[PDB]
Amino acid sequence: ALWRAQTQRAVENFPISGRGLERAQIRALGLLKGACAQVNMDLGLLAPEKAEAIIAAAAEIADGQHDDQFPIDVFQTGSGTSSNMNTNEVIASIAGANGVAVHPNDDVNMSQSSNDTFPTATHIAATEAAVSHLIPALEILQDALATKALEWQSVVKSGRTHLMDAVPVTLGQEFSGYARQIEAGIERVRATLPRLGELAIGGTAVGTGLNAPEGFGVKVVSVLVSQTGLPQLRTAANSFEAQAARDGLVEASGALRTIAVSLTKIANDIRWMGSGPLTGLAEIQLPDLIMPGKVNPVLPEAVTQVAAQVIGNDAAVAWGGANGAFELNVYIPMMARNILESFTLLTNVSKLFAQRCIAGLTANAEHLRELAESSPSIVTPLNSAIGYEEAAAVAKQALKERKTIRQTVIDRGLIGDKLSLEELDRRLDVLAMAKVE
Amino acid sequence: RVPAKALWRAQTQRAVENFPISGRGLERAQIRALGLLKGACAQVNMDLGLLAPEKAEAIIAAAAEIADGQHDDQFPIDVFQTGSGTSSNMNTNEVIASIAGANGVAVHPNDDVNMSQSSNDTFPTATHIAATEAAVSHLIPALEILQDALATKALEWQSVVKSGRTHLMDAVPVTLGQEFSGYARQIEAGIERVRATLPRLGELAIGGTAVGTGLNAPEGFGVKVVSVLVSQTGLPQLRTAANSFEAQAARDGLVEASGALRTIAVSLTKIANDIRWMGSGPLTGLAEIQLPDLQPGSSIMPGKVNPVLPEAVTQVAAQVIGNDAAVAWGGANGAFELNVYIPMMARNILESFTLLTNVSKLFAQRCIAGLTANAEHLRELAESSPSIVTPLNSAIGYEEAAAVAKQALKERKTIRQTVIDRGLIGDKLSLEELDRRLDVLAMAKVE
Amino acid sequence: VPAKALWRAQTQRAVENFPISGRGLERAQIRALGLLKGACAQVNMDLGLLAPEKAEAIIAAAAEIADGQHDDQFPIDVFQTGSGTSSNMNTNEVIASIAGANGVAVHPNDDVNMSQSSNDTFPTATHIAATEAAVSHLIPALEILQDALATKALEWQSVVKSGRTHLMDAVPVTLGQEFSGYARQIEAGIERVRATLPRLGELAIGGTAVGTGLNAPEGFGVKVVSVLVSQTGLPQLRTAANSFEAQAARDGLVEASGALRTIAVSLTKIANDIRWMGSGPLTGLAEIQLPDLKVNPVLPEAVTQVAAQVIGNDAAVAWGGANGAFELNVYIPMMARNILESFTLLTNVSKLFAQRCIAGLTANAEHLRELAESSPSIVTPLNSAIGYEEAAAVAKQALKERKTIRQTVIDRGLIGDKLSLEELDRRLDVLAMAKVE
Amino acid sequence: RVPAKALWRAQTQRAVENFPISGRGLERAQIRALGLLKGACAQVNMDLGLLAPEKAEAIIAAAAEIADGQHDDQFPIDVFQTGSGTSSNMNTNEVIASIAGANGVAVHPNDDVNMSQSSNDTFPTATHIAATEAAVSHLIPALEILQDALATKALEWQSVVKSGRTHLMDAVPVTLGQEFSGYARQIEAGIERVRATLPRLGELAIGGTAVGTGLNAPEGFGVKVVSVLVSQTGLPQLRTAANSFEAQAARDGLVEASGALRTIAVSLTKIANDIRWMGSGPLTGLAEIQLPDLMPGKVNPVLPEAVTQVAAQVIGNDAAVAWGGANGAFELNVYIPMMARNILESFTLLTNVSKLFAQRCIAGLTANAEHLRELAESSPSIVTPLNSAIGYEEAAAVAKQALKERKTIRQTVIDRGLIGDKLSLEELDRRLDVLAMAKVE
Secondary structure, three states, X not given: OOOOHHHHHHHHHOOOOOOOOOHHXXXXXXXXXXXXXXXXXXXXXXXXXXXXXXXXXXXXXXXXXXXXXXXXOOOOOOOOHHHHHHHHHHHHHHHHHOOOOOOXXXXXXXXXXXXXXHHHHHHHHXXXXXXXXXXHHHHXXXXXXXXXXXXXXXXXXXXXXXXXXXXXXXXXXXXXXXXXXXXXXXXXXXXXXXXXXXXXXXXXXXXXXXXXXXXXXXXXXXXXXXXHOOOOOEEOOOOOHHHHOOHHHHHHHHHHHHHHHHHHHHHHHHHHXXXXXXXXXXXXXXOOXXXXXXXXXXXXXXXXXXXXXXXXXXXXXXXXXXXXXXXXXXXXXXXXXXXXXXXXXXXHHHHHHHHHHHOOOEEOHHHHHHHHOOOHHHOHHHHHHHHHHHHHHHHHHHHHHOOOXXXXXXXXXXXXXXXXXXXHHHHOOXXXXXXXX | OOOOOOXXXXXXXXXXXXXXXXXXXOOHHHHHHHHHHHHHHHHHHHHOOOOOHXXXXXXXXXXXXXXXXXXXXXXXXXXXXXXXXXXXXXXXXXXXXXXXXXXXXXXOHHHHHOOOOOHHHHHHHHHHHHXXXXXXXXXXXXHHHHHHXXXXXXXXXXXXXXXXXXXXXXXXXXXXXXXXXHHHHHHHHHHHHXXXXXXXXXXXXXXXXXXXXXXXXXXXXXXXXXXXXXXXXXXXXXXXXXXXXXXXXXXXXXXXXXXXXXXXXXHHHHHHHHHXXXXXXXOOOOOOEEOOOOOOOOOOOOOOOOOHHHHHHXXXXXXXXXXXXXXXXXXXXXXXOEXXXXXXXXXXXXXXXXXXXXXXXXXXXXXXXXXXXXXXXXHHHHOOOHHHOHHHXXXXXXXXXXXXXXXXXXXXXXXXXXXXXXXXXXXXXXXXXXXXXXXXXXXXXXX | OOOOOOOOHHHHHHHHHOOOOOOOOOHHHHHHHHHHHHHHHHHHHHOOOOOHHHHHHHHHXXXXXXXXXXXXXXXXXXXXOXXXXXXXXXXXXXXXXXXXHOOOOOOHHHHHOOOOOHHHHHHHHHHHHHHHHHHHHHXXXXXXXXXXXXXXXXXXXXXXXXXXXXXXXXXXXXXXXXHHHHHHHHHHHHXXXXXXXXXXXXXXOOOOOOOOOOOOOOOHXXXXXXXXXXXXXXXXXXXXXXXXXXXXOXXXXXXXXXXXXXXXXXXXXXXXXXXXXXXXXXXXXXXXEOOOOOOOOHHHHHHHHHHHHHHHHHHHHHHHHHOOEOOEOOOHHHXXXXXXXXXHHHHXXXXXXXXXXXXXXXXXXXXXXXXXXXXXXXXHHHHHHHOHHHHHHHHHHHHHHOOOHHHHHHHOOOEOOOEOXXXXXXXXXXXXXXXXX | OOOOOOOOOXXXXXXXXXXXXXXXXXXHHHHHHHHHHHHHHHHHHHHOOOOOHHHHHHHHHHHHHHHOOOOOOOXXXXXXXXXXXXXXHHXXXXXXXXXXXXXXXXXXXXXXXXXXXXXXXXXXXXXXXXXXXXXXXXXXXXXXXXXXXXXXXXXXXXXXXXXXXXXXXXXXEEEHHHHHHHHHHHHHHHHHHXXXXXXXXXXXXXXXXXXXXXXXXOOOHHHHHHHHHHHHHOOOOOEEOOOXXXXXXXXHHHHHHHHHHHHHHHHHHHHHXXXXXXXXXXXXXXXXXXOOOOOOOOOOOHHXXXXXXXXXXXXXXXXXXXXXXXXXXXXXXXXXXXXXXXXXXXXXXXXXXXXXXXXXXXXXXXXXXHHHHHHHXXXXXXXXXXXXXXXXXXXXXXXXXXXXXXXOHHHHHHHOOOOEOOEOHHHHHHHOOHHXXXXXX
């Protein structure tokens, strides 16, 4: 039981959601307090006994030893002051228990304000989320899809446009498109990093840096980069923008929202291809997670639900981001919750979708080819041999009798001087029609 | 392999391994609703001679423990699970079977605990029970607390005249009471909006079984179960669905109810924003009212209170708006006989109910109730506005009235003092007539 | 100022100040402004505040506007001052010009705007227009759609097919049952719109600048509303419950937009099912045929795109709604644009969808029944005669040979002492399994 | 039955009758992109020897009239049409065929004007052309104008000290210049955000034909058409798609670009809200700055209201784009006309309002500098540097007395008799130097 009077009052003030800061947020706050103590010691402003104790307490917090010591609601003062002081109070208690007296404000918060610390910890968490969690999970997903694209490179089937019969494509081509959407997702997350990684630390109460030592922010960021291995962390381009607004969070959520849109398409196609068997498309078999197989598309359902959550969370992030006033945007804890949750859900579901659905998909190449070979969409190359009228009669009879176009052309007595069997086979070569590269 | 204290079994444990996505499971209220439903189903199956009394009574007793919140640690499955909520349905069946078994009665999770049921009709039923209970027993009473606090303050401030603001610019007089009666109306209308959703929010799918047809459930199963649920919850809002296909193919009642919560979020944002603006400064702001200090510390400095409750309220509203977008997205995307976005939709709507309930009460009791106004002063300020010179026109002419306005601003004085200063009291008008014409409380036209 | 222009100086300035979208008010918004100005002139006359000669010229000019004779006289951008003052003045100026050309001098502010402020006039016209749109346009179009769906539900009451849950094969239903579900969604949409009318019909008129009624006669609003009800035949129009709430907020528009948003969600499901039912034919479900306008499902596409627009419009309305300050919400023209567009799009596409898609659908009943009679989903009723192990084997062989369950039971030599042909047909009666009520 | 002056034909008239939904057709920029595309296709088909030069040149000339805005009245089909935009594609082919015929050359709308193209790779190409042009040639230049206006104020007001505000409550000093530098950065970052979407916004589907495979287009048709488009538009951002299937099965590039516009809306909401608050009152508000005007003065903040309403529209439009984007199926996303409407409108609104806001509001702002500095010098926030001279007790007593009497800290220190051997006037003025507290870099 390590927090003190201030945190206790915040517990009483905000019984709203019953949920507090997440592991990554507590980690970031610990990392930040350690870096600030280090710099304050480097500069000779904080006595080494005090600093080394703070640095040790902060390392415990960062390592996840005191997650039970952060009871404050997400829905707290919009600067995150409550959680800032929560971290200061906890560090002080730990230091004192190791027989070193430090003041939560004067020592643990030395050279800092809430207004620059809580957004810094938020951006450390979000940058770490993008770089060390989500991008690698997206690469796992891109690789699974790309591997399918290769495996199925020659697996010809019918295209569908407007949900209607269309000319041939391969499953490999379609899956290459999904792989590109996830590759583009990775490009989209990376494109946000130059601004997501900007940190407010050193701007103090209003962005001017008053009561912080010269270059405090530069030095803290330097320590943070070396401790996290994230070179994307950087001092803000403009100290006022970095505290008056959280636009980088709005930007990064936009990339996550685009990824949610891509995943909705990929997952929807996958459950449709797996549908039926009798009542559906029965094109592929999904891994099952006395009687015939009927696998529910549970992972596609989890993906599409996660995407809806990201859409909603993204709307909440933008709403908070728009509503800053003057020197401070006071929607930080709510914005932090939503973007970090979006990173988490997308990271975790992308890996599961790749590994326990995509990877083990199967298809019947022989059957899918025989079906593409049955489509009215492929009769066009016959027009110059048999005329538009016979071609339409062929298409009708093929559908009615449930035969291939080839077989119907044979059945209707069209093989002869104007159309040989080998010419028929050439003009109706559905794999060639897919134009595989 | 299952933990030793665990009352769940193999199907639940598989779902734990399949969906490690958010790390969050069903809320207390959803678990309670699953318990209530399973008890009521066992009661009806027993009533109808379909389930032997020894089995049914053990299931009913076990389901009551769940409903009473004794087993909230027995529901480990992620929110982001199969979209019908089958995993959570099975979780409930397994936990009930374990409880029954530990009491010496063997029951089958599917054949007995799920008798006459599907997951497709059970999970959306439990969802609508929880949402209806949230609206009726939690949110409406919290909104009533907030409405009453706003209305009490409006009466207290009935004669506290100040300048209106339109476009953020100086306007004619209003009272703080009048503005607060407007806030109270927004909350009163919020309650009306939630009540208007109840006829459809309260519809339950139970009895529709796998596809809405009621196949493999006894005739009138749904009607009988709903009757038991109404008796046990005291919620007469719970009813059988008007159409059994609509009630499974869609979750449109959740979308509708979320829309009401979204409107309330919009109202709360306006109310909270005004109150923190009125509290702003003191020196750089409007300094119209003082908010209760929720963070006092030892100090010999002038007071400066942060508007932490309006910040909590406005952040809650943002969350409700996001949650509402999430609900609508899941709601649109059903296919054929089943909408498979249920656990995600349930999570978002029930959270919006919880956040609004909790923050409305806090806002009412720890912010609204103790607001104070700077009143003799708000009045001096309204008495200084160029907005109030119009009623002088018919005594002194609009050109002199305009000069009065300009001089008042320049010398930072009341309109009244400026009229006196310019020597107009005499033949043009008496002091009593001036005071009648410039009575700013009267200009507010309090009803 | 253009020669044929009936607007004057203030309007031409607004034209120059807001070249933003290049779109002005819609016909319905212009009409409502005309109705309002007519009603105000009538009341001011009744009260002896406005000379009859002036009032009658204003009344006649306002009626021309209400009748759509001057839809070209309102050039101001939607994106104008957020009270809609510019459009208010635009109306006053146009009326003055019409009166003038009929030989009667009236002052746009002192006469046409007598007893009024822009702050109570523009939202009043907005709510008149939205109430009119709901009652006289949308609900009648939804009724046409509900009737078309219900008609199909009846026509197809015995058209048995397999259900689909998770997109996977399920026990029998009828096309008629599914359409009854669609009809209920639309019936419920009508209830939803009706439920918003008590607050959508609330009008701010009489509240003047800040909601107090300063500079309007006692009971001005009630008297104006009385005239409006009498002219429009809309009993839903009413004075606001609270005059401050009615000007400080536009919550009734947020509420009404929420009902439109729910209808958009319902229409998305209905249109999606219909285009899937009509898909293929070869590569899809081939359940029904859509009227031609292999037909692409162009009306389901128009419906789903309209619903997307309504979702977006609704987000804009809520954003405006939350952001009022003190005595006035200044997002009215934008909010009005979006809600009124959503009414119009839903009205027009609902009628088209009903009359040019739903009404002419045809069902492929034999293909539907054949599939249902071939489903492993229907073997359960055989258990009590042949055992679940044999029932499983029937299901497997039926799938392998593409035969009905019935024929498979015969083919496996099960008819005789185990069960008779009559008993087999009773147990496998798929229409009976749908349990039509 | 078709109107007399109409250059469209039967397929377009059927579309007019089929989709009477919104009553609104394509915008000028969309019609222009369709003409540009058709001209480029005819050029390439002629280059490849597939289209006779007389036909191709007639098509090229017609398409140029369309690209030049000469026939924006010939496109009557509703936005809410078939979701591939096939109807508008056919509308373009028919209008071109009519123009060619009026100029004495017979061409077939399908066989000639649509040669090598399909009903599914044309409309998304024209959409991405229009969106790329809008981003590069219209929006970014307008944001640069706004950035410059804000940056100019940041410099002009670099010494205009005032009190900071956090949580809406009094805070330590800043300058108006510093606050405006924050706004300028938001707009500069908004330009960075738009630029960041260009590698994917500029990808074009042309050449993929019906399903993305390029069936029935000549080898390299896409590459060749893109080269002509680049030369004609001067937009090197136009490029062939990385993956031809992704470019038709999805419109993810539009969702991405809409996200950047949404962020700009979020930034503009903050800047406009601050500006109208600064201009508020005069008596009831903050009265920090005076806005240009578009009895005593009381200017309504009309441009901040226009900006915040535009921002709301962009937010709604952005939701519509994402909803359409998510809902493709298999080889084609069929929400193209609706997505195009919304993203292109968001570009147009932000372009026009940004320029107006910059030139007709920001440029002419004036600051109440005396009142601002005097207020900063009156703040309890600035007494901390007195602690070491007069002690905590008197520093606090000074803050209280200053507020009560509506005086500066400086005058209150004098009034309390605190000037002596522990504190000179020169030292008092150093310690209470509010501009120095703003630490202007």
